[PDB]
């Protein structure tokens, strides 16, 4: 047995195994799960999140290992169960979310088995965990960290239970290691070293020291103004950003008051059909105000622009985030000049002011003037854009200024950096600050 899973042998309420891909954490565990099955008449549940039939569960594992060591004659091997026949030890595989009716009801479960941990919500583990309740009784768990604030890293990584055995392990920690395995890796951590540490390292998603933005204060702004009772209330803004040449899809925001209503991304569209698409949803959408990016490819739609929107009251405006601040001689509230380097700056702070508040109002109970704060209505937008745009805001980055002022990392220097596509919806979301 490989060693380094020794302390899981001992007997402990929680053992948790998180890491990279590779780090043979899966075939360990099915290793040891197998081997004490051949010695105690323990019932072994194997459950997941999601189990939409029983291909998706660990059984083919369970009976890989078997036939690799040579005990096939010692078990019985249906389709939804695996039986020793000397212990009586038996193997179960039920997700959380199809069967929560059957997960409760089962009796006299020796030892759980949660795997791909990282999909598993906060609701299943609440429905879980009170079940396996017979003393004695240990919950297994691996996974690969996806973001730092999911419910599974919080609950044994940050904020651990009693008596936890938490081990961690990469593919630095797999003797043997495919070669299958080790050439996908290597060709991942020369294209993307981010997504490298990501991925086969195992280092979750956590914010940068360098964000403008807390993923809190994301949650706390949605429907925002649905908790503190007040209504969207003012002019209609929206954005376009028409992204580049490259394959990165295009941006439309929008919103009314302190309310936005639309997040849409655009997809398979050149300039002028982009054009034509945010163009449109402006309309649709009543602006008041429409505003785009023109600093790259962006800069010749003006005359489309002007055209699409004839007959209607809508001012349309090029802005350029790499131009100088917004009414820079005017005092700071030292003056505005002083203090952000450009207007892409002077606007993600406005948003990020904004947002801040909301949390603060939210959270902490503190007033705030519904005029400042920002709310993200989610009927409206659909969950679905709601989270790309969450996953954006999260990477916008402050970098140095040897002048003191504040400036952010650019589109293209995210996209190097952090191996990220360009966020075009935040910096749609961005310019409504305008
Ligand atoms: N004890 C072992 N003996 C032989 N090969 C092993 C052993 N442990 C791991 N491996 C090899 O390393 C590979 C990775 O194993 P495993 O699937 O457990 O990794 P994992 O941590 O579950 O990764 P993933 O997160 O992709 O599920 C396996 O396919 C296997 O071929």
Redesign the pocket.
């Known amino acids: ?2 060693p380094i899973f020794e302390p899981f042998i001992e007997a402990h309420r929680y053992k948790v ?1 998180k ?13 040891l799960l197998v081997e004490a099955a051949r010695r105690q008449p323990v019932r072994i549940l194997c459950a997941r999140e999601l189990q939409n039939s029983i291909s998706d569960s660990v059984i083919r ?1 369970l009976e890989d290992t078997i036939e690799r060591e040579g005990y096939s004659a010692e078990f019985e091997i249906q389709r939804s169960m695996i039986r020793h026949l000397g212990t009586n030890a038996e193997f179960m595989f039920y997700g959380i979310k199809n069967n929560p009716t059957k997960i409760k009801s089962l009796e006299g479960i020796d030892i759980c088995w949660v ?2 941990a990282e999909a598993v919500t906060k609701e299943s583990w609440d429905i879980l965990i009170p079940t396996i309740r017979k003393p004695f009784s240990e919950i297994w768990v ?3 960290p996806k973001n730092i604030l999911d419910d599974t890293y919080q609950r044994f990584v940050v904020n651990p239970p009693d008596d936890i055995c938490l081990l961690t ?1 990469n ?1 630095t920690d ?5 070669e ?2 080790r050439l996908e890796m290597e060709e991942c951590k020369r294209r993307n070293p981010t997504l490298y540490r990501h991925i086969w390292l195992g280092e979750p998603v956590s914010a940068s020291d360098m964000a403008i933005i807390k993923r809190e204060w994301l949650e706390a702004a949605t429907d925002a103004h649905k908790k503190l009772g007040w209504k969207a209330k003012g002019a209609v803004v929206s954005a376009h950003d028409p992204s580049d040449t490259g394959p990165d899809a295009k941006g439309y925001a929008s919103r009314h008051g302190s309310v936005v209503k639309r997040i849409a991304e655009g997809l398979l569209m050149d300039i002028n059909e982009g054009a034509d698409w945010a163009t449109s949803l402006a309309i649709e959408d009543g602006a008041d105000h429409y505003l785009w990016d023109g600093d790259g490819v962006g800069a010749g739609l003006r005359r489309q622009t002007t055209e699409a929107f004839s007959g209607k009251k809508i001012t349309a405006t090029m802005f350029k985030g790499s131009e100088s601040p917004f009414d820079e001689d005017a005092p700071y509230q030292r003056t505005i000049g002083d203090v952000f380097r450009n207007k892409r700056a002077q606007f993600y702070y406005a948003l990020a002011d904004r947002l801040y508040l909301t949390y603060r109002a939210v959270v902490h109970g503190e007033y705030a003037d519904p005029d400042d704060m920002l709310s993200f209505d989610k009927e409206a937008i659909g969950e679905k854009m709601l989270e790309k745009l969450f996953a954006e805001l999260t990477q916008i980055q402050r970098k140095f200024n040897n002048n003191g002022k504040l400036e952010l990392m650019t589109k293209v220097e995210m996209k190097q950096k952090l191996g990220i596509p360009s966020p075009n919806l935040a910096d749609a979301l961005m310019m409504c600050m305008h």
């Open positions: 047995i490989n195994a890491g990279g891909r590779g780090s043979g954490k899966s075939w360990a565990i099915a290793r594992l795997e791909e691996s996974f690969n392990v593919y797999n003797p043997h290691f495919p299958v395995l």
